[PDB]
């Protein structure tokens, strides 16, 4: 029988106890070892409802990453509640590891294996598992990095597409590698490189999926963000403990085989996890370099007025629940009783 149930999950990971890297440290304390051979059972002749936008699993992960960041990081200056505290702020090793979320006894995780599952509604190819796949808690706007990819063609999802207020989550099937670098020896000047040819073709195939959703006669266009905090206006992410803010105008203007985005490292940032402000030490001299798989996007549609035949889409993000959602959309917890 079972039924949708909220319960405290526990986590599993391949974290290393000798590693002082803060994700490894957190997981070492909070998680258990992963199963070598994880079992997966198919449920023949079974239909089950899913709702990625109303999934308690997302909330539990949200809580973990907030505490992870709140525990791990050490800004030189922090403002919270009109109060200012200052502390030692050494640089730290920062690199997310995959985390698995598992159901306790008396509960179980259902997994939707249906082709082209749009995020809500019937799933006919359902299976049960002990734990989710390994999920890297990547904090980022406006692209989803190091995530999972659909084997088939691109898939776009929304709680409701005719609702302009609701975010659109794009799941790619072919990833686009992006290398960000702060040149060795302005210490805040950085830049990201990715394939032009690969990004244009990506944008095109996204527009095709958007056309399926809004109509063939609709002409699709991509514009930069309408405004907001620096974090959501730019493509913001972490790389080697440093906080990057990359100008993504070249990624989201659409109607040189490499695309170079001008980036800036910022010491003074807004905290995504709480009200206030944090200040970190300036970046290390030497080499700061990362290489991430662009695996998804967060988009927002203008709407705003009577349809002009044209639909404008802009990069989104800001609510990290959507980041977790892009990985947990296929899972739901049930009380197996």
């Amino acid at each position, epitope marked *: 029988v079972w039924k949708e149930a*909220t319960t405290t999950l526990f986590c599993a990971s391949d974290a290393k106890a000798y590693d002082t890297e803060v994700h490894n440290v957190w997981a070492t304390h909070a998680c258990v070892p992963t199963d070598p051979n994880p079992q997966e059972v198919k449920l023949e002749n079974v239909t089950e409802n899913f709702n990625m*936008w*109303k999934n*308690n699993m997302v*909330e539990q992960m949200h809580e973990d990453i907030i505490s992870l960041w709140d525990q791990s990081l050490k800004p030189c200056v922090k*403002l919270t509640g*009109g109060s200012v505290i200052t502390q030692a702020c050494p640089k730290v090793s920062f690199e997310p590891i995959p985390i698995h979320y598992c159901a306790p006894a008396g509960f179980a995780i259902l997994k939707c294996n249906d082709k082209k599952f749009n995020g809500t509604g019937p799933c006919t190819n359902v299976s049960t598992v002990q734990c989710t796949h390994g999920i890297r808690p990547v904090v980022s706007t406006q692209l989803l990095l190091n995530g999972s990819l659909a084997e088939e063609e691109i898939v776009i999802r929304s*709680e409701n597409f*005719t*609702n*302009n*207020a609701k*975010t659109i989550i794009v799941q790619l099937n072919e990833s686009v590698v992006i290398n960000c670098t702060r040149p060795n020896n302005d210490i805040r000047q950085a830049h990201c490189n990715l394939s032009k040819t690969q990004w244009e073709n990506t944008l095109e195939q996204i527009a095709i999926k958007l056309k399926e959703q809004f109509g063939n006669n609709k002409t699709i266009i991509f514009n930069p963000s*309408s*405004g*907001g*905090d620096p*974090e*959501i206006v730019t493509h913001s992410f972490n790389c080697g403990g440093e906080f990057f803010y990359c100008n993504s105008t070249q990624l989201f203007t659409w109607n040189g085989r490499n695309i170079t985005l001008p980036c800036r490292i910022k010491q003074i940032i*807004n*905290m995504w996890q*709480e*009200v*206030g*402000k944090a200040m970190y030490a300036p970046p290390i001299r030497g080499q700061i370099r990362c290489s991430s798989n662009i695996t998804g996007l967060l988009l*927002t549609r203008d*709407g*705003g*007025k*009577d349809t002009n035949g044209t639909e404008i889409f802009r990069p*989104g*993000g*800001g*609510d990290m629940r*959507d980041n977790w959602r892009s990985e947990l959309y296929k899972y739901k917890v049930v009380k197996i009783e």
Partner: antibody, heavy 124, light 107 residues
Framework: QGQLVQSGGGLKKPGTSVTISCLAS????????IHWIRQAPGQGPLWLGL???????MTAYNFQDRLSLRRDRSTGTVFMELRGLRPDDTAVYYC??????????????????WGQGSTVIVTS | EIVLTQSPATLSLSPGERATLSCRAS?????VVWYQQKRGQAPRLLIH???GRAPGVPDRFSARGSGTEFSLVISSVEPDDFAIYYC?????????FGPGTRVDRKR
């Protein structure tokens, strides 16, 4: 709980701009959308814009050239700037929160908490 | 965007009588929310989206509907209920309010 405390407004001359602030609880600022809504004398409420918890700004098409929204994550305050003021901008201006179907575990829409309102009077 | 219309303009009632306010939508909606407003005060949410009544709201208030037609029912009107009532739609921005239905005391 669950408070929205506004400040700003007053007598403005036509052509000028006005700024209204709205201090929210940390919980509200973190979890809820905050609308900007006005109500002129003898009229019903009119939606001007909102700020999602993600930070996304959305304004009414008829105000987008004169209206600007922003938030200060340092204190948990949101703002609206209305430029090129006209006599018919005279109204009580409200900030008001709304889950917009995004707050767990109920996921409800409905503007449940309103600020005290900021009176703006545009005239010469 | 949508267009909302309410009826009647005014509902005259004696205390104890059943009130039913109507809200009509130009196109199909999933739901609408209802607000109460007295003079000098800000709007007060009555009914949250699907579904039920806001905190502090008494049991006599109820609402239902789908698509074009929605309604707010007050089973037994009390003196505190005489006010203006608005419906509101969430299909997309800009979020429209209804013109309002005035509930006054019958004589």
């Amino acid at each position: 709980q669950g408070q929205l405390v506004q400040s700003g407004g007053g007598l403005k001359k036509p052509g000028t701009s006005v700024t209204i602030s709205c201090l929210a609880s940390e919980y509200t600022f973190n979890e809820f959308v905050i609308h900007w809504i006005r109500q002129a004398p003898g009229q019903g409420p009119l939606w001007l814009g909102l700020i999602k918890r993600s930070g996304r700004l959305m304004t009414a098409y008829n105000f987008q050239d004169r209206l600007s929204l922003r938030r200060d994550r340092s204190t948990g305050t949101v703002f609206m700037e209305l430029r090129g003021l006209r006599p018919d901008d005279t109204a009580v201006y409200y900030c008001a929160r709304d889950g917009l179907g995004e707050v767990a575990p109920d996921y409800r829409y409905g503007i449940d908490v309103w600020g005290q309102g900021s009176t703006v009077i545009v005239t010469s | 965007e949508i267009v909302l219309t309410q009826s009647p303009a005014t509902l005259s009632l004696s205390p104890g009588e059943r009130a039913t306010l109507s809200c009509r939508a130009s196109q199909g909606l999933n739901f609408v929310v209802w607000y109460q407003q007295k003079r000098g005060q800000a709007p007060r949410l009555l009914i949250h989206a699907p579904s039920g009544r806001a905190p502090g709201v008494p049991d006599r208030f109820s609402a239902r509907g789908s698509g074009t037609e929605f309604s707010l029912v007050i089973s037994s009107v009390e003196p505190d209920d005489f006010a203006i009532y608005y419906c509101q739609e969430y299909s997309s921005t800009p979020y429209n309010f209804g013109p309002g239905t005035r509930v006054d005391r019958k004589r």
